[PDB]
Design a protein around this ligand. Structure first.
Ligand code: NI
Length: 341
């Protein structure tokens, strides 16, 4: 059964609620982004209307084979009417095609559902600036002050410099990057660009990337592994055994692997600045864990919420424990008392 924080009161609408069978009274199903915890339950057999971005809709059609007649893509930053209710999709600064959704309820209530997001000051100059929001359904993934990590730009700078240095010192090194979902494409694309290589990958991953409207993509990716010195592999293979095994397959073209595991936050962020990060090494294989986040840091989330001044906040992440729920409620009250709304 569908939980309360996936329902939009005063509408026939749900958000990210595909794993509960037919939801009672739901006339339209919104999908914020193509990540499996959110799309869970969609397939070619789904026969209700799905509302989403253009990119999410390309993925629904080509990866899950949802039939075209039930896909309703909407443009961003554009007031649209859906079953009698005005909605707007805004860029969530998450993975490709990820949106936040503003709902203008018939009774005058305004609701913002962030989906998954990485709050940024640029959002303070979207269509959010124009009006009041009564209820915020907030991605609270990292809602605790211990969650600090660098900007995406700093992390990419570290990665490009690291890869460029290693391959310039050794022209026979291979760079490997781990993946398990869409998002974080900048990591592997930036590395390939500085090295003048295309990124090589499986047919299934190439297919996924072809759905994402990235400019000049035919120029950056390939299924021909032998022509590439940046390879993508599944995240589970990014360990000394899986990499030793991959190196065997490259037929004596390479004698070293430098690999990257983009993670979210890890506890080493408590102690170690991005500049100071070092790999785990065994023989001719080095592995860097880099904190490339597509969710708000605590400080980024706090700044967004204190700007927005919502009347009520409903968390959508870490909602399963009393300890988490209590912690999050205490922060929302601090924020409110500090800023005065
Ligand atoms: Ni996500």
């Amino acid at each position: 059964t569908c939980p309360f924080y996936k329902k939009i009161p005063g509408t026939g609408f749900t958000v990210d609620a595909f794993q509960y069978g037919v939801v009672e009274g739901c006339t339209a199903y919104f999908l914020t982004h193509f990540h499996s915890d959110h799309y869970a339950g969609l397939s070619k057999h789904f026969t209700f209307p799905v509302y989403c971005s253009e990119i999410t809709g390309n993925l629904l059609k080509n990866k899950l084979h949802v039939q075209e007649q039930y896909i309703h893509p909407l443009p961003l930053d554009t007031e649209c009417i859906v079953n009698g209710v005005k909605v707007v999709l805004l860029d969530a600064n998450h993975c490709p095609g990820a949106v936040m959704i503003l709902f203008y309820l018939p009774n005058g209530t305004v609701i913002l559902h962030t989906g998954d997001f990485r709050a940024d000051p640029s959002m303070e100059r979207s269509l959010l600036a124009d009006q009041k929001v009564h209820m915020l359904y907030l991605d609270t993934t990292y809602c605790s002050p211990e969650y600090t990590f660098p900007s995406q730009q700093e992390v990419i700078r570290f990665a490009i410099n690291t890869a460029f240095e290693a391959v310039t010192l050794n022209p026979h090194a291979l760079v490997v990057c781990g993946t398990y979902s869409i998002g974080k494409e900048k990591v592997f694309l930036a590395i390939a660009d500085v090295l003048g290589s295309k990124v090589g990958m499986s047919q299934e991953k190439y297919k996924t990337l072809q759905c994402l409207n990235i400019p000049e993509i035919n120029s950056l990716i390939t299924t021909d592994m032998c022509s590439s010195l940046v390879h993508l592999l599944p995240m589970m293979q990014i360990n000394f055994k899986g990499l030793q095994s991959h190196l065997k397959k490259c037929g004596g073209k390479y004698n070293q692997i430098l690999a990257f595991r983009p993670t979210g936050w890890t506890h080493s962020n408590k102690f170690t600045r991005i500049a100071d990060v070092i790999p785990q090494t065994k023989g001719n294989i080095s592995i860097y864990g880099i904190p490339y986040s597509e969710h708000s840091s605590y400080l980024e989330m706090k700044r967004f919420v204190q700007w927005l001044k919502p009347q009520k906040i409903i968390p959508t992440v870490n909602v399963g424990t009393w300890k988490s729920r209590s912690t999050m409620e205490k922060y929302f009250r601090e924020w409110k008392l500090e800023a005065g709304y």
